[PDB]
Design a protein around this ligand. Structure first.
Ligand SMILES: CCCCNC(=O)[C@H](C)C[C@H](O)[C@@H](N)CC(C)(C)CC(=O)N1C[C@H](C(=O)OC)Cc2ccccc21
Lengths: 333, 333, 333, 331, 331, 331
């Protein structure tokens, strides 16, 4: 085909990156994370009870104010690394980046506050495959590629650092104005899932971990780079950080000195320098700085897997290949 | 009539201002915000489940320990700017400031933690009109004025700054020992709602906003001065603050220098100096100070409306006129 | 008998102290607080909905993966000082410290986020008596003592300060390598509850409170030393601290100077020096330090009672006597 | 039967200002109320934006004001740290809830220093006419003639680093002091100065035995002394001049003497607390004291001037009937 | 049709470094890019762990690198604060997305001081060959011969205390400046120095009337001057040398002059903001300024050197075609 | 078969005290345990509240104590920073879990300075009898005669800025050291001092070549030296005396030498870390060092005294059988 498109995203604390789509005719405008870690679309409903406080706080979809809605009704529960949202299915037209498709998505009427009361975004747009789509509902990407319109079955992400542009996706391509050198692709391990083989993690200078090959899910809808508790713990122990309940942290004087960590994907080595991983808002002996790596256990559906989220993409411009099933990396500029 | 009365309130972080009432015979004592932004009375129930953690944390009303209770039973759901509480109706005698009335109020059995786990008060006393009373239940004020007892159908609020007196309401009047100059009244725009016409907001020195007339609900039960997201955003942009999810904030060195904001109500101009709006607990280049203005969207029931809460009353002693439907302002001393 | 045993615990912020047990055959491993303030065992279920976010975050018990489970099914709701958990009963073998017993415990399917989203532990092991066991379910201790195996019907706690060993329980005894001088016992006030008579609290140098005898529940599963709001308030007022919603706090320069507080239990006096009570992470005029005493109201089941939690045990190694119903104290080393 | 309080801002314990409206409808500005002078001045639009000080502070815009009443007589106002020069004009200034018509000055020349540091825009003098530059009738005098206040008095309260302070024109507010005041009489009308009979550092009358003068200034931050008496004192405090400011070590703070200003026949005492600025107790850091030398000139000065430092201590009441000053403990 | 940006780290506004890979597969290190020199050096495994500086920093390990190409000619590199000594070797260094083969040095002797304070491991010179120690062809020259860049240019952007900075080798990135540049021409090829025609503190050309030299160094943190001209300036700022560094009081910050570097026929101005390090506005504390004397030696030096301080101000473009430097406001 | 540890508080790394009970039922107070002296003293009710130091600290109230046993012989206790004067009395003091009867002093005259800075109430000497003022049998000697301890030994552990420290009377706790100790022998019984054979700043034996003395004081915060040797050292550290305390710049911290105390034939080394107080790495701020001159008098002093600074380093064991001191790395 020959259309190319991008949505443009907003970067929030480097921890949450959202763009906009419009459901419905008159469009309802919601803010959303474009997630390769799942395959479903949902936004909050008007039918959600406001005794859930997150629904008091995000925009809701009213469909009886939509000329193009179309009733469905099956229940659908989404489980994620880190919260469930439950709700029901519906269809209407959704506009992502000037491309309009009629997508089947979920209207959530149960929206847990933790974490969702802390989300600046409204829902989620899974960029995943049919395979991981609860309810076996076609996903936006597969639908846009039906439309015969893109010049390539590729979408790419640019995540920026923070305080113009917060990020950018491009559908049907890759803006070469935000990467350099070449791209390097790792073919998908099974398919119907963005999982890649990962050959080893070096902290400093040696394979402390990942050592006989592991899995690396490349996930845009994740903020941190994470691994199992068990190798998280270990990496942690090296680097020298404590546990504060949900994140590790180092004293900030120590900060600009943690070694580099490396990620060995296809004969290349993705290294992250200490600043790319620590959230330095001090350099002070008395104050705690947390790092951008975490523990997360994702179950055998697909995990155990290391997940490479924002930490990572923010350094390496990523393009996700459909035509060919693989992922490629190149250096963000 | 010729009684005058006041409750005396406690000021919490300048963000939450509560007094005490007693329901029931033997009184049960609950702490409450006196709210002109709504018209209903509710307190938590004993019948509330303690799996809602806010009910584990506030006092509950047991009515089978009340000689004067009187069964009702309709359900009633309260929606507010910022949380829902749901529950059922009941009647008992309520004592506000030495005046005893038998009021129909709600027993809440669903109490959302966010925000209510952070409330120092137990419930709410709407000071609003029958009109905005869910369930079309008479409100305390209308009942006290039935009692034939006040010398005037007026109540007034004094909110203090913080660390004696945290505030004070006076029923049937106004203590002139806490205002100066004269009062200035703005008549109520429609009636059955404390809404007034508001002619323009100046940040600095020019009408950046409110410009062709807007609405200003004067609300005692609100802590911040707020407007729609859309003009909030804009004011914000001027003044120079960021967004931290729920509030804006400025670096504190910048702090004692944000310009003044003005509120144009009836040919007078309500100005707030920078200190009246910023919560300065630092003056430091490295630390964030949040401001006392926020975004809040209140729906067409009554909003879009700017809401003038504590920020505002704390500077201008406010009296709310019943006899004559209007609001008057005077300078708190 | 002649076995003695200890579990070893982890100390988290001096505020939460957990050890490990294994339910089920293959063991499922959960982390738990050993609580003398209650008498029931529970851990989270797999059957818990993940729309409760605390269940997404703690390990769950699957029993259909347990060869030795045994179905029960009665509902059981646990109310505590500070949250409810609700769930259902089950039996399987539980291993505490190398001792294996088959215990009837609860599988929680409702787990409130606040507080449980902030708990590093998974459930609880009540060390209390049959008497306070909801559902009149035998407790682990009574079962282990059935097993005929301990040399004494005693368990003891060592809580450590913080950043080797975080703590230690010993079943059937007391490690003399962690106390000094002698032990001193206060016999249990009624029995079927760890409550002791408490003769007076001195702040500084005089009985400000507790003065005509009061109750002191000795509770390991509590972090702070607390009393009723009403005498908390008062003690507070002396010492000189404010209220921040849930804790009091003092300015930290003031910090290393609050007087000592004394606890008069059986002709001895338990004194706590200012550092044992304040959480000093500054000494600065501009910053707030909170203290390790709180208000808590526990209802007439057993309260009003002062509760002596971690604050206290951390200074005085405590042994709880079964054989003889009493409690003894000795100085932790 | 009136009284008018005005609420004050405290910026760092070093400046306390509050607000006024000049004009109709009123143009509002941050003013410092001083017992130090007698003239009212706010910055002017006619102020060149060449002066940063004028670029960054609010300007009075005269025709945006209906009561404006031209005068243009040129004024220079030399304080004891700062000349600003400008021109006389007229209007209504509303202070508290009072509404007065006064002659104020519109400044058009502001020094960056000291003023790019002031956080308020101007100054309101609570001083006599004798000290006014232009013998321009000041605002308390003008006010005291409307007949409305309840007393020819005006007090001050200033907080420690909440409120900030308050002026109560017309009387006092008891909510802020403890005790009953003691007055100490005006050494001569014209200036808010009294006679002080000995500054006793620590234990024994060290300095100023044998009287001297203390002006009482609501518009200064420190307790000032002349350079050398300051030297003598400090030498005694055990502090040393660092670079700028004298210093003592955090630790050392709590161990310092008390100074007591013998005055009026009663000894007014302050402590280490009271005069030292404790951003720490760190033996590892240095602490500033809130007492600074200030040599001011021959009629007024040479004199001690009891500033925010002393006022933070004792609530003050300036009294015009009796041309006396009272002091009670501030609370 | 290329360009290559490299992203920079800012440590305290005092050092900005970014990364490089030496080797195959590439061994990556934190480098400072300097207009100050012309040689590339990273620490060596052969560095004795006797030198802390070598114990704590990353070492180049040559046989862990297939392209390694021995040379061993001994180098000493004397900068204007720091000699490090080492030996010549070969390899491929990849910078941005470029991939070059260069002769770099493996240092084996590092001074603790200054280096146990550097946070990056080495240095990359963007200076001429004439200034290279060994007349060793530098990395921009080597690069400019692959034919790939889009222009014989390389610019710098450095943030205030987020990104940090960027080099854009080959051209400029507009996203970071406002305006159109003005060049000011190389006083003679060989060094990145220009002629400056007057440093005017505050209002009137105080110093350097009558030209002088300013080297433009991407690798220095401050604006340096010689000792006494620094003295003269500061004397004028009203600062005083404390112990180490000159100081001014927080308060006093915002009141200081502006310095403007007259150069190229255009006046390049900085302010108080621009040159003072404001960890406070506290009248109760002292503030460092980001301008420091630096006497450097006779051919190069004596000269002014416009460091991170000036670069933070004006985005820079070093231009090799035209052997000129451009400046636009940084944004 | 006993041992008795006592848990210590660390206030700023500058004081470590712990608790004692004097009386029946025991009246408990914060004491510093010193190897510096030999007498036990807590403040007295009979202390006049004229002395702030006595107003703010806990007082021993003798008849609130059944074992009280009057004596009234007047004591003055002159330390090397502080005389306090008082009177001898009797009672039972319980320390750890031991319960001893001793003669302590009830102080009635406390100096504000140094004491309005102490945070504990008194002092417990772990020194010999020879050094006791009154030749009053000290608490370790009295204790060592109940027959109960396991060894004529008592050690110390002090944390970096959690626990704080511990004394273990009777023996050592391995949980806090690594390694096996090495003793270095008492230059003469009477005092806890040894002979030190050279203080080598940085690399070469700079000072004290040719022996000198080091008292080992559990009750001092720093490593002290005499004034001029301190001068010589520091001069070498590159620090300068600021006002009070010597200073070095944050940045500069990590670059400083190591000092190593040659003693006992083994070299006891500390580093920059070890002796510098790093409230920052800011090149923008100044840092204090934990080594301070302290000229103490002719028999005892002149001598070096290895304080909290050195003890924080090496865990210490004072040994009375063998009248020797051991040191192992603290952990
Ligand atoms: C059932 C389909 C999902 C199965 N798989 C997963 O859940 C995978 C492994 C995780 C899934 O992609 C995650 N990243 C998507 C979510 C939305 C749950 C991530 C997530 O919760 N967030 C990511 C947002 C984000 O990181 O943007 C980059 C940040 C955030 C803020 C507040 C609440 C949630 C939230």
């Amino acid at each position: 085909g020959n259309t190319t498109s991008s949505v443009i995203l907003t970067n929030y604390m480097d921890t949450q990156y959202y763009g906009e789509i419009g459901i419905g005719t008159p469009p309802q405008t919601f803010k959303v994370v474009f997630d390769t870690g799942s395959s479903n679309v949902w936004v909050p409903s008007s039918k959600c009870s406001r005794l859930y406080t997150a629904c008091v706080y995000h925009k809701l979809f009213d469909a009886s104010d939509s000329s193009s809605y179309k009733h469905n009704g099956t229940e659908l529960t989404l489980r994620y690394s880190t919260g469930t949202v439950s709700g029901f299915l519906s269809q209407d037209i959704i506009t992502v980046g000037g491309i309009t498709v009629t997508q089947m998505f979920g209207e959530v009427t149960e929206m847990p506050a933790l974490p969702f009361m802390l989300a600046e975004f409204d829902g989620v747009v899974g960029m995943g495959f049919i395979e991981q789509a609860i309810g076996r509902v076609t996903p936006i990407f597969d639908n846009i590629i039906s439309q015969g319109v893109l010049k390539e079955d590729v979408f790419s992400f640019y995540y920026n650092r923070d305080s113009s542009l917060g990020g950018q996706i491009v559908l049907g391509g890759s803006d070469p104005q935000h990467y350099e050198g070449n791209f390097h692709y790792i073919n998908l391990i099974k398919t119907g899932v963005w999982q890649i083989q990962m050959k080893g993690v070096s902290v400093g200078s040696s394979t402390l971990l990942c050592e006989d090959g592991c899995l690396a899910l490349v996930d845009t809808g994740a903020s941190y780079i994470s691994g199992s508790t068990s190798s998280i713990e270990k990496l942690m122990e090296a680097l020298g950080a404590k546990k504060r309940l949900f994140d590790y942290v180092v004293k900030c004087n120590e900060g600009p000195t943690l070694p580099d960590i490396s990620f060995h994907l296809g004969g290349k080595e993705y290294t992250l320098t200490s600043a790319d991983y620590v959230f330095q808002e001090s350099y002070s002996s008395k104050k705690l700085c947390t790092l951008a790596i975490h523990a997360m256990d994702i179950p055998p559906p697909t995990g155990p897997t290391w997940a490479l989220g924002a930490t990572f993409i923010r350094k390496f411009y990523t393009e996700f290949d459909r035509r060919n099933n693989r992922i490629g990396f190149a250096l963000a500029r």
